[PDB]
Amino acid sequence: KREAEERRRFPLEQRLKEHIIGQESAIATVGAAIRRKENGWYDEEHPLVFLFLGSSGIGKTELAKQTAKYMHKDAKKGFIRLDMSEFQERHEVAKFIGSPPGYVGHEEGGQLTKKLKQCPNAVVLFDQVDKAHPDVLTIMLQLFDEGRLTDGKGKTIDCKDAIFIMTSNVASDEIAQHALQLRQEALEMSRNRIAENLGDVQISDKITISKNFKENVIRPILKAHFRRDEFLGRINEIVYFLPFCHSELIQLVNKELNFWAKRAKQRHNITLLWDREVADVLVDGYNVHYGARSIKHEVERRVVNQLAAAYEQDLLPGGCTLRITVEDSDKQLLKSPELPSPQAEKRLPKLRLEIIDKDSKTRRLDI
Amino acid sequence: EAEERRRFPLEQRLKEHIIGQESAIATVGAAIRRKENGWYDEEHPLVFLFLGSSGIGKTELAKQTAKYMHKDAKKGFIRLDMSEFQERHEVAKFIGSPPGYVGHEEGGQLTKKLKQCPNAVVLFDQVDKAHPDVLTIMLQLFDEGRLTDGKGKTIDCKDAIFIMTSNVASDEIAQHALQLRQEALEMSSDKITISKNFKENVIRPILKAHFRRDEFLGRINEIVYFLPFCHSELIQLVNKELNFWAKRAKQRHNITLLWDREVADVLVDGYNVHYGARSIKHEVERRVVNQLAAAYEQDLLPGGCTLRITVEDKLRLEIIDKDSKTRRLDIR
């Protein structure tokens, strides 16, 4: 009786916003559908079927993992992860259900059948479902249709309430192009409202894909790739992951530096602080092709190796305060927005650690 | 003898010796109280089927029950392990061999044990591992409590109590308790309850897929479920294992042991959901007691001293003197 009051205190939209910044339309959609499920105002005869279309490494697996962590205390048993890139051939279809009688691994059964037996209402996630040929997806047709799966032994498992989540990278380029168009148009109307000196109207930064674009391109490309309209029919909701925006990337840089500062304070009482130009240099390495993975690895290659070298060199005393700074001779290069020649090599501006003492004296560290 | 049973009900003894399982203990206590009042049907013995996961306490519950009903377990407790009876011919370990064959004069083991004590509690331990034919052998033992030996002799055990522990439908009820772990703990007395339709709509397909006979499940009087341990039950288990070791130390060499409220959290952190009370038991036995034995060899623990388990700012054993000064022990 206290679960609805707890969710009234801390809804999952705030929990997911704390865990993952950006794409608040996706958060609102998954929160509303989950709220319909967990309130009880939901048709139990069919499972909750999510499809996420996104770019590479945008946080879809993190979103499903945090959803399963919110739903279940144990994510080892209450959450299932399956990589569809491995399951190219129809032979891998067998390991959903196990072999027929008379064959090898008949007593083994299916891994998925035993996994749904061990947790019938688990959050189940398949990543990159476009990699698998839809002959694999033909099992999941009836599995999303009625929640019942038949194995090789003939035991029928019934999971009518399991949240089944698909995540895919298909049509990521078209969503990226259209969302770049919408970002340019929204910046155009924002600058029009600025130039008309109208500040009474307040519009939040919520850009949502319109219906006509979806009906024009997304349903035909999904029908063409999946080659089966029936598999697209059982999907309870489609969700679009918009490509990364500037201010949320800045907030991402702030949080991925803040986590290292918090773990430094937790382990060795090391208070790390940052600069705005440090955040600019870290957000400069933004690659859409790797998604947030490129920014995270750029953060690692820039500051994590330097902080590790300072830690193993024992040059960070306990109880001290540290500041991450940009090199002085590179800020002048940052201040010049000139187009570089293609025959000149590009130099990454270095990052340094400064010690702030009790007498407000800056100490430099070079290793 | 009603005064003695009013002084010491078996629920008090069971809660004194095993923790958790407030519904299973109450169920077996209600059945044993029905036996104690003299208003059970004297033609039919009591049959129990225990459904629980690993390390929950079914075998210990049967042992403590048969310790209550009979003072000697060498006569009043007959335990047969079904791990031998994996094959169809293993049936011949209950009854005697047919006449003219090997071991015919040796007789039936279960018939001899029931003839030694007809009131004795019989524990069919781990009845998952039995062959389905052995189930049909003890079909008549549950139907009337009457078993025919290989020599033509026939033993009656209408007054006996039959306990079986099983592992077959242990996952699903645990999964059921999983939502109860997200409901009964979030209901905040508070209790963890298994729904009444569950035992007939879902559990009976597993019981029919494993035991395959309607008559075997019909002959069993009571189906007793065992629920997985909660957080407070794991706390009580940690304190019970530590109190067992402290009592053993005080009985052996007069060594007082202390643990704070904060110490039990890192011991509950050493727990497997697939395991049971034995995981917490040997985790206590390894992490704490090995340092005690190492200090006891090294003569670092004189008798009458007071020891405190402290979490590192590792479980460190600190000697507490009368002057409130902690002394760390350096173990080689």
Added chain:
Amino acid sequence: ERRRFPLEQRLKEHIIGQESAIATVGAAIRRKENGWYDEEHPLVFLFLGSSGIGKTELAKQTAKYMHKDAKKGFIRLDMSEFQERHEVAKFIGSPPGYVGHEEGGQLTKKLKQCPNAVVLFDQVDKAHPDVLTIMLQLFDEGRLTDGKGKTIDCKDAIFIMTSNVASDEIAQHALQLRQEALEMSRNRIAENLGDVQISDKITISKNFKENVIRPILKAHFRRDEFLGRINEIVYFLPFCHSELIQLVNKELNFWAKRAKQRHNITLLWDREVADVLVDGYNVHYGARSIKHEVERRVVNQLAAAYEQDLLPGGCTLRITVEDSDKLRLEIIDKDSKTRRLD
């Protein structure tokens, strides 16, 4: 007796390597021998590792520690012959009315001789996973029923189980931990931090102990209460290069001792011939890859020399460095005049 020559030092002199494994085994043996062990539960150890590490020899030396004599208090069952479901009767004897009922079980008779014995289930991963229901019964309380129903108590026994499951996992993670330790050690050589004594005890991390090893044991053994009843799980790491040097030195000590007992032929060697013996080694075959290699390089040459009576007795030998990349048995004289033998 334990305070001067414990299990740790005798095991380290008899078996090289496996510091944490001997530490865990001797800690549990210490708590058993002090009298601070629980009487109900017999000790269950599951030994995991690659091939040629020394788990069977560790169990043999533990059994010789319990009973100074051999052949009596050491009951070893090899689960290569237990790969069928119907081999359970080999534990317990035949049921009444069937062939071999009067002979009883062999395990029952051997635990009837002595109940405090060291029982070694060797290569226990090879057994069919219905045989281990008897292991459920025996590890639960320590009692075993015969063909005639005679329940034998076994509460003073020590059960040691050796296996090869997760051998690739343990070996590959130990190789990664060795690589990372060598990287940070080479950095420490670069950083000149020699003022801190480096405790070179590479152990398996608890995340690796709990997230990959427990699922693969659950996949091979196919039961959860079985892994619950196992008290201690002891891993075995593969050797590092210093351990190979110590092992080749120990084996050459063994062969020099054998020659001294046979015809008093004192034998000597050098560091470089030990290094070229360590070069002939494979990580999969383990210490056996060392052992026969000596017989493929050294002892065959001594046997060939002794067949044509070239070593009458009392002579001193030395083994040298090959020049083909740039083994020789050399008799050294009392005047230090070496002579090569063919």
